[PDB]
């Protein structure tokens, strides 16, 4: 009955998307110089993981980082002097994501145990113990990010997202509307919005304060595995299993540029930006990472050296180094 | 060296003590056998957990004949199986358990789909996976007593028209066994370990121990390079 009305609304939305595309990002950005060949060298090589690295997250002071392995270990790395700061044992070894606090006090971890564990680092006792456990999801917890000390947004495999309250232990906002498993999560720099990518080949922009969706982006042909905002808080890049990256914009409400190459058939695990947003780093399944020019779609650099699939990819806050974590149990720091 | 300050030397010493504890835990994590417990709740799996013992993964730790088994039950997932099946690449063996007596029971959904054919397509989707090419599968055909009491009333031809034998127990059970064993496309590196449940103390555990013994022998032959 109202399916025809929904189809008419989709007609109006994509007609507006066609009407807003009066130009092309490839045509306007012809007046800029190319970046050339980016040559980056491994400065540090972190060793001591005996399992498959699935996630990392940089610290707010651009020196410490966290690492999540499948032997039940969260290791806090001092990236300058290769030291191990903390080795947190995990109650469940099946951990697919981890996060670090903007104040440096807490560490989140989650996975197939459907529980978001929040750990306190600055305890008076001297050891890192379990502070909170958020057991409110019925699907696998795929990503989690810290809005604040007392707030966390989690994305799970039950096609929903959640805004929590840490000191209480219950969720404050439930985000529903996805028809696929939400795989990746990225917060805005001003921490007012976020965007989530799911297995239904669509990325949805959510609202923290109101609690409902605002924009929905299509264009992908397969499952979306990675997402990351452009550092101004207005655009974001998505990575799929179609061996293509896509640059979506919130104000134009359409895609901008597709990042693809002909011999690459393998999916994207993790995307990230630099501090200026000129370089887009994306780790693939061909044992490598690639540094694309985010304004010219040129393959500006190749980061090789991992023996297995590069799972996680992080760029620090000041833009100095790039950490790459792979399934060969080595974290490699590039500069 | 002498370049480091008084606190950085103690930080390096703390890092070395942490790395020693990490390798001492990694040896114990590598000296244990992981078992991925697949199947469905309608087939009967918690009874096999209770026989072997005596909210997304149920971890069961048990020791038999000085071998530590960690069994991971993933039946509580309500999502797509593809996005988390790649985590179990380093598992030693799959234990897959389906019921015989559900040969004629229809599924809970409104569609007329047999539970036995849903189990065979699930076994075909799991067995023909790129992550589990060198992973052995231990098949448990459950509810033999109920299947024996039920096959005397209903024929096997209602399931699939291929069966042309008699309505006896042993021939039909062996034919269901070979129909499950025909789904293996990769017959070179993978072997299917089909075993009817005995429902007796130290029988299924003994079979799983012998299967894990054969897989550890194959892994040791790969580690030697003799294989």
């Amino acid at each position, epitope marked *: 009955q109202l399916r025809q009305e929904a189809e008419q609304l989709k007609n109006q939305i994509r007609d507006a998307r066609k009407a807003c595309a009066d130009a092309t990002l490839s045509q306007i950005t012809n007046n800029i110089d190319p970046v050339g060949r980016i040559q980056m060298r491994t400065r540090r090589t972190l060793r001591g993981h005996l399992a498959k690295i699935y996630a990392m997250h940089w610290g707010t002071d651009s020196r410490l980082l966290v690492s999540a392995s499948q032997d039940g270990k969260l290791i806090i790395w001092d990236s300058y002097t290769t030291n191990k*700061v903390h080795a947190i044992p995990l109650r469940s070894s099946w951990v697919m994501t981890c996060a670090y606090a903007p104040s440096g006090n807490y560490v989140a971890c989650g996975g197939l145990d459907n529980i978001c564990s929040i750990y306190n680092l600055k305890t*008076r006792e001297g050891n890192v113990r379990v502070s909170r456990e958020l057991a409110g999801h019925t699907g696998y917890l795929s990503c989690c990010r810290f809005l604040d000390d007392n707030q966390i947004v989690t994305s799970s495999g039950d096609t929903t997202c959640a805004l929590w309250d840490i000191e209480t232990g219950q969720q404050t906002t439930t985000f529903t509307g996805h028809t696929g498993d939400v795989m990746s999560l990225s917060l805005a720099p001003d921490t007012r919005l976020f965007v989530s990518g799911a297995c239904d080949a669509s990325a949805k922009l959510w609202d923290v304060r109101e609690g409902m969706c605002r924009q929905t982006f299509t264009g992908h042909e397969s499952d979306i595995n990675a997402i990351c905002f452009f550092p101004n808080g207005n655009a974001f890049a998505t990575g799929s299993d179609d061996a293509t990256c896509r640059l979506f914009d919130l104000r134009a409400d359409q895609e901008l540029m597709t990042y693809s190459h002909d011999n690459i058939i393998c999916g994207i695990t993790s995307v990230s930006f630099s501090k200026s947003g000129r370089l887009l780093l994306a780790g693939y399944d061909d044992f490598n990472c690639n540094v694309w020019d985010a304004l010219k779609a040129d393959r500006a650099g190749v980061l090789a050296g991992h023996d297995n699939r590069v799972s996680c990819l992080g760029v620090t806050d000041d833009g100095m180094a790039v950490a790459t974590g792979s399934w060969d149990s080595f974290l490699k720091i590039w500069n | 060296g002498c370049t480091l*300050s*008084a*606190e950085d030397k*103690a930080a390096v*010493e*703390r890092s070395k*003590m942490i790395d020693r504890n990490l390798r001492e835990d990694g040896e114990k994590a590598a000296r244990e056998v992981k078992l991925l417990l697949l199947g469905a709740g309608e087939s009967g799996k918690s009874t096999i957990v209770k026989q072997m013992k005596i909210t997304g993964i149920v971890e069961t730790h048990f020791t038999f004949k000085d071998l530590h088994f960690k069994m991971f039950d993933v039946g509580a997932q309500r999502s797509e199986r593809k996005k988390w099946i790649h985590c179990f690449e380093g598992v030693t063996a799959i234990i897959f358990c389906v019921a015989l007596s559900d040969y004629d029971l229809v599924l809970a959904e409104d569609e007329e789909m047999n539970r036995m054919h849903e189990s065979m397509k699930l076994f075909d989707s799991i067995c023909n996976n790129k992550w589990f090419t060198d992973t052995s599968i231990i098949l448990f055909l459950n509810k033999k007593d109920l299947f024996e009491e039920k096959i005397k009333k209903s024929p096997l031809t209602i399931c699939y028209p291929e069966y042309a034998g008699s309505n006896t127990y042993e021939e039909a059970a062996a034919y269901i066994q070979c129909q499950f064993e025909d789904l293996n496309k990769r017959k070179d590196t993978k072997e299917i370990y089909t075993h009817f449940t005995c429902s007796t103390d130290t029988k299924n555990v003994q079979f799983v121990f012998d299967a894990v013994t054969d897989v550890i022998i194959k892994n040791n032959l790969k580690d030697c390079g003799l294989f």
Partner: single-chain antibody, 234 residues
Framework: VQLVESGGGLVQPGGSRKLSCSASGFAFSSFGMHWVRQAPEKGLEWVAYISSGSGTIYYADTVKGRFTISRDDPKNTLFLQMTSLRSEDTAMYYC??????????????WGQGTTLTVSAGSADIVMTQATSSVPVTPGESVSISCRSSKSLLHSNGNTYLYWFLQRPGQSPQLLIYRMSNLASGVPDRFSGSGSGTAFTLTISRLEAEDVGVYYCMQHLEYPLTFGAGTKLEL
């Protein structure tokens, strides 16, 4: 979190005595332990230090050979075997915990203190304070300076100057670690600064609780030489 040490008392001159510190309320196995002595009329003085896991052991230059440090992690007990102690060793002994990583705050918690009463160095960085007694009033801003014999700035960027407040009749506590970071439980009244040679400690809107003796400390190299102590008075 508590460190209670015992074993002191009247000792015959030339004898021996073993001390024991019971640690409870924290992770004992991951902390390096210190011993600090204090003369009844002079300042504090470092004695020894054992690391986490009994790996690295440091002694002071005036107690080497006589004293012996040992720890027991299942019993959570730190021992101190003293042999052939002389007339100088009559002092008040403190037990200190310390953890060392990026962002750590060592010398944070201090023992209650035990007494010892017997019946009676050019390479070290000498710490010297410019004054010994400053008459203060509650409600003003008071600054106290210091002087070091060697530049405490290291090539990594840190500066190993720690500040301590010993109230009369109580144990000392940590105020400022690394000269730019406040310890936990310390108000925002205390503030520290330095130039790598001359250091300053400023106190805005001072209160009557802040009276006591201020000790500085260098941690650039072992042994740990302590300041003379600036006593405040009302």
């Amino acid at each position: 979190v508590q460190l209670v040490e015992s074993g002191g008392g009247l000792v015959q001159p030339g004898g021996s005595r073993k001390l024991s510190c019971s640690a409870s309320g924290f992770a004992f196995s991951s902390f390096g332990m210190h011993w600090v002595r204090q003369a009844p009329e002079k300042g504090l003085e470092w004695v020894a230090y054992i690391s986490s896991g009994s790996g690295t052991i440091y002694y002071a230059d005036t107690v080497k050979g006589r004293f012996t440090i040992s720890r027991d992690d299942p019993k959570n007990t730190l021992f101190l075997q003293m042999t052939s102690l002389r007339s100088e060793d009559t002092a008040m002994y403190y037990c200190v915990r310390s953890i060392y990583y990026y962002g750590s705050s060592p010398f944070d918690f201090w023992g209650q203190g035990t007494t010892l009463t017997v019946s009676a160095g050019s390479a070290d960085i000498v710490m010297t304070q410019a004054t010994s007694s400053v008459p203060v009033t509650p409600g003003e801003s008071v600054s106290i300076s210091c002087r070091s014999s060697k530049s405490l700035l290291h090539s990594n960027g840190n500066t190993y100057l720690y500040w301590f407040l010993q109230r009369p009749g109580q144990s000392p506590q940590l105020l400022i670690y690394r000269m730019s970071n406040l310890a936990s439980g310390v108000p925002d009244r205390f503030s520290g600064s330095g130039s790598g040679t001359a250091f300053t400690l400023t106190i805005s809107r001072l209160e009557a609780e802040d009276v006591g003796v201020y000790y500085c400390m260098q941690h650039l190299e072992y042994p740990l030489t302590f300041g003379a102590g600036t006593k405040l008075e009302l």
